[PDB]
RNA sequence: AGAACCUUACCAAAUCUUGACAUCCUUUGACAACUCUAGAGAUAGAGCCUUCCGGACAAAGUGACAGGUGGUG
RNA sequence: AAGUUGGGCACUCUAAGUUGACUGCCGGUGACAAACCGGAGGAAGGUGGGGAUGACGUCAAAUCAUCAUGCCCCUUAUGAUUUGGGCUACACACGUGCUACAAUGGACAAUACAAAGGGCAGCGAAACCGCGAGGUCAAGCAAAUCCCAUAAAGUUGUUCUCAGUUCGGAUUGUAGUCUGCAACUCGACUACAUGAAGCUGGAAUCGCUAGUAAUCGUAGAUCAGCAUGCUACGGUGAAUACGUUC
């Protein structure tokens, strides 16, 4: 019923996560990127991998991993980054160059907050306290607005419902607004619990 | 004695900046450039059924627009050719050179 | 296929099976699933058990049956 | 020479219209107007700006027109003629504006909406 | 549920006769946008009536419309009764042309030009189907004259 | 889609006309675009995520 | 009367020829041109020699009873061989692979509610 | 947003039981693009025979396992 | 022959950056307002036209058959491979459409004017072969260049002359073309021949306020082949709105 804000804003004030051009092997390149992203997500679950950007030029693949824990991905001796690069080169015939971008405030990143709340739900925390503290810390860190929602079999009840908490401004109809949105799923013993988070850090 | 450069990109911003960069490089290398010439943009429209099941009457319309830019180099020089071949454009834009 | 420049279609296995025992007058019944095979003059006087979906309907080939497909004499659907 | 150039647009029809001192003859794409346009109503619409400005027969018109159909091209030519008369004499601005001939008719063909047979026509509805 | 009244369109005069009424009659006759067919049909009908009457086509057509144009109609109001009410001049022209064309299309002639010519001639003589329609409208308005 | 069905689509067909397209992300056989090799649903999801270069919501 | 069937006196010659079974507009035109007769001329206002030439051209076109008998023989052959087309002819259903769930009236007759 | 085969789940017949498909464990090196016989085909039987980097990738057996467009919107 | 090329970038056009409409300005109203009515200029005047964008919630509304998943069930079978069938059945009822019932028309002859799209082993010109669907060879083109691709309705003439017809083109026979391995179940198209119902549709019921309705064609996705469907494009182009009691 509500348009995905990322989908609404892509190409207006938000750039694509895949930056390249093709005319003949568009499908091959797209699915190469998809499998690369799936591999990165499966391999860096523990790391706070906010997102990944993929570009390609001169038969090379530039990967930019925006994460909140660059130490885990790089490694103390830079061994983890080299291992990831080698695995990606093995998977894809092309040559891959990987960069890591630090996120200073992981609590203002929609995806990181969504994954954190989903992890707490899997650990069987309180679906109300988790959202309350998440919104509190996001708001105290200077966010102009934040909205959190969790839906499913909340406390294990037979009847599934959804609950949300807001604070500040989340103008989903403003196309100017740079609203970050994320959805995550917790695999609780009762089933899938869907968490959604919207963050609006203000005009930029 | 002309050299054609065809740039194609999904973003008019990136295509314009790349065209300006290559024009500046050619002018620095000395050759004379006529352009940039903006060729018509090619827009491909995709119509998807919004719902996963039934609900034929609700659709969503996406588009892919590729902008096209043309550059003509009139007085080529080895320096101009070397500079053009060594210049690195952003990954978004696709460049084709016809000598 | 249908176009004249291409010869009338017929399964190679079916054609060779029919050609087998051509000299002998004790021609037997040929089980076939090839509803798509064309009927050549060579088939006249033969008995083909043609699969119609669940069972092989026997069909006896005569001169007037030349040019039709083996499926035209093995109905697939049942009504009343 | 003494050419008065102008451009007119209507629907998808663009007409480059030149006015020269003449006897009132109009040539469109190297063809006579009364042969190019299937109806005399279109010719009268073309002449309408001349009637308003009160300079009927004082100019010969040369038209390079493409796009649209015959009515669209006729009205694009009329717009071009009005603009050319403006260029020739600014004193005709009041008369042309009062006649409403300087306005570029903004009406275009509305897009088709998804889920509808046409721009507005919707599928036949049937309760039950 | 309506903010107000919308501006009305203004058609151009007939190219040969220079008559807004002739232009509007052409628009009425036109079907599926075949403006040319409408124009040729109307001009042929005008020529036929001119030939058969020896009088100006515009004059006879004006007489016909004057004969088939109503003055009163019966519009329901409410406890609910139809009330006679004067007809606006533009409703007069609209109804005259509409009835003229509608009852022309029902005539027994072979071609629409013949049908329209005969209908305008009968209306000018005050003995046509459109005339009958106007007469019925006027008498029922008189019948309900009390409620005015 | 069924895993066996996807495997059979991926495997080589003895004939050549017997080849059909499936969405390579989920396996849906219907409404699969050639340019992306994706079904409409996966296409919409990835366009929303912004992972299809140059594919943005259209309006005109 | 050409080919043993009377043809409309009023009609033009070609349109009257079409009334002969097995004659269609293309073959009426071919016959009329082979036998040099004007298309405009009506059959009633037609020369005896012209009529004779028309008959001579027509006789070799395999029309009327011969054509009807040939078609009936073909239909009987396909019925007798027990073909799918023959079975559908016998049952009065569409023969050329139409759908009978709906829209089969031209073969099934009027609706039997 | 494309039912002659495929799509295709439903049905008849012919068929397989670590399996059409994923990883792991044992062991081998070519695993085979090509051909020929029976087959409606899957398949099976003869050829053959060429390809492979600590070590690639691929096959023979068994078990963890796989598989389900099966049910509950 | 041809913007065909020499020559030009004036005009059109393409597309980046900008100007542009904001109740800005002037009259009356109005509570010193907010707003309304009119006028000027202006391509556009009062959110200009159209799109995207759909609040808290309702219907335990739809989807375990896109995908994912709690729980249950089968594991030499509810799993799996293959040839054939079925999904196209047919006494029938309903919805949505295409073509018609004709003279504002049918046939034939000549002759104008668009937009938006697609093309790699794909789009396929020219020519020649056939009545035609198409075939032979083969030019141009990874595109503002070549091709799909000549728009049709339209205009101007000849003819028919009010009827189941020169309307209509369903059904059927014969002869073919193409794609595909293969068109019987079960593809499209062409030629010859046949020539069904149908003479404007009961109760009832639907869409639309302008470049709209109606009408005419054009292109694309899916696709080896197959469109009256869907999604887009333009050509011609109406009638009407008194008004808000129902
Ligand atoms: Zn998918």
From TrEMBL, chain B:
Q: Which SUPFAM superfamilies match?
A: Ribosomal protein S10
One Pfam annotation reads Ribosomal_S10
Provide the alphabetized UniProt keywords. Answer: Ribonucleoprotein, Ribosomal protein
Which residue intervals define the domain Small ribosomal subunit protein uS10 in the entry? Answer: 4-98
Asked if the record carries the keyword Ribonucleoprotein, the reply is yes
What Gene Ontology biological process does one annotation of this record name? translation
GO function terms (MF aspect): structural constituent of ribosome; tRNA binding
The cellular component terms of Gene Ontology attached to this UniProt record, alphabetical and capped at eight, are: ribonucleoprotein complex; ribosome
Under the subunit heading, UniProt states:
Part of the 30S ribosomal subunit.
Q: Which family, according to UniProt?
A: Belongs to the universal ribosomal protein uS10 family.
Mind telling me what this protein is named? Small ribosomal subunit protein uS10
Native organism: Staphylococcus aureus
Q: Which gene is annotated as encoding this protein in its UniProt record?
A: rpsJ
